[PDB]
Amino acid sequence: QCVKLNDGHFMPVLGFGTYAPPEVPRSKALEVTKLAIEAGFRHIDSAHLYNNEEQVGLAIRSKIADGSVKREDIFYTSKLWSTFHRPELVRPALENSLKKAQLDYVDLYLIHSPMSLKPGEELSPTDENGKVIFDIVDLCTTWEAMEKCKDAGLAKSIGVSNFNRRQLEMILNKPGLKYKPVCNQVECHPYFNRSKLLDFCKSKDIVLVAYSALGSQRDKRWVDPNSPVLLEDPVLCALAKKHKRTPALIALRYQLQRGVVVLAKSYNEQRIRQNVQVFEFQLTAEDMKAIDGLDRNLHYFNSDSFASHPNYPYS
Ligand SMILES: NC(=O)c1ccc[n+]([C@@H]2O[C@H](COP(=O)([O-])OP(=O)(O)OC[C@H]3O[C@@H](n4cnc5c(N)ncnc54)[C@H](OP(=O)(O)O)[C@@H]3O)[C@@H](O)[C@H]2O)c1
Ligand SMILES: O=C(NCc1ccc(Cl)cc1)c1n[nH]c([N+](=O)[O-])c1Cl
Secondary structure, eight states: OEEEOTTSOEEESEEEEOOOOTTSOTHHHHHHHHHHHHHTOOEEEOOTTTTOHHHHHHHHHHHHHTTSOOGGGOEEEEEEOGGGOSGGGHHHHHHHHHHHHTOSOEEEEEEOOSOOBOOSSOSSOBOSSSOBOBOOOOHHHHHHHHHHHHHHTSEEEEEEESOOHHHHHHHHTOTTOOOOOSEEEEEOBTTBOOHHHHHHHHHTTOEEEEESTTOOOOOTTTOOTTSOOGGGOHHHHHHHHHHTSOHHHHHHHHHHHTTOEEEEEOOSHHHHHHHGGGGGOOOOHHHHHHHHTTOOOOOSOOOHHHHTSTTOTTO
16 A cells, blocks of 8 residues: 655555664564565665664565565665765765665665764764754755755655754755655654644645654653653553554554554564554544544654754754
């Protein structure tokens, strides 16, 4: 089940999230990506940041080599990390990701974040207060570099991630724009449902892709443990009992019914298979209204590390 993007390529509407924190052994990403393809996932979300592209790429190539899928059946995404926003660094970062995955192309390459970081060896160059060391880059010039990558065939489609509406607007009104972003991948779930951003994306034929749709991995680097746990929400739980589903399935189905493409990360064999059940049932209009009521402007990513950055999108 696929949505047609504004460049004419096609994106599966449920995607598998591959990130696991560093205490998870690298080899697991390989195992669980194969499991996710076996279960029916066809859209796979990785990044340079995640340090797993070699494992994710191998899982994909294994599922091609054993005859399970064709390359053309898999939609693989990676992302340009914030230290590589300077235009001259964009193509080389993409080539790096292709060599890691051993793929001839990515189906989608995103600017991972609007918050440009000082170029260098560190993923997160830090200032002493622990604030990321910012860089001033015109993201319009980073976007022109992305467009060159699509023109060379390195990425079939190009898009952005963590952009707010005004940031998206800036790209859209760029003089001489050749390709609009196909998508904006952002934090989106019933506690932060981004309905104003969704409406703007829909008006621009840009797909909103929801990450942390199940409420995030709750990593203490960036997430306050007092924050309400999305999957313990009583309304989602009540809806899970009503449909004899689970609160995750409720959270995933809500996105599809608003025209949002949705990611789900799991490294558990059972939950991976469970998550494809999103296609097996429907929420009613009143169910959707109840879930719309949960919105509380809650982004789980909420650290002093980035909240002072000049291009923080939640400002
Ligand atoms: N563009 C960005 O800046 C950005 C930011 C964050 C994430 N992402 C992408 O989006 C993906 C997903 O977001 P996320 O990693 O924040 O996690 P998520 O999809 O919100 O899932 C959070 C947790 O839900 C659990 N879970 C999954 N299925 C479940 C089920 N059926 N029942 C109960 N619990 C279940 C998982 O634990 P188990 O593994 O134990 O099942 C997972 O750790 C990431 O992996 C990454 O690919 C992108
Ligand atoms: O740093 C990350 N994103 C950049 C980012 C996150 C939030 C905001 Cl507001 C802006 C930029 C990250 N991306 N994916 C994962 N992951 O766990 O899947 C992590 Cl962590």
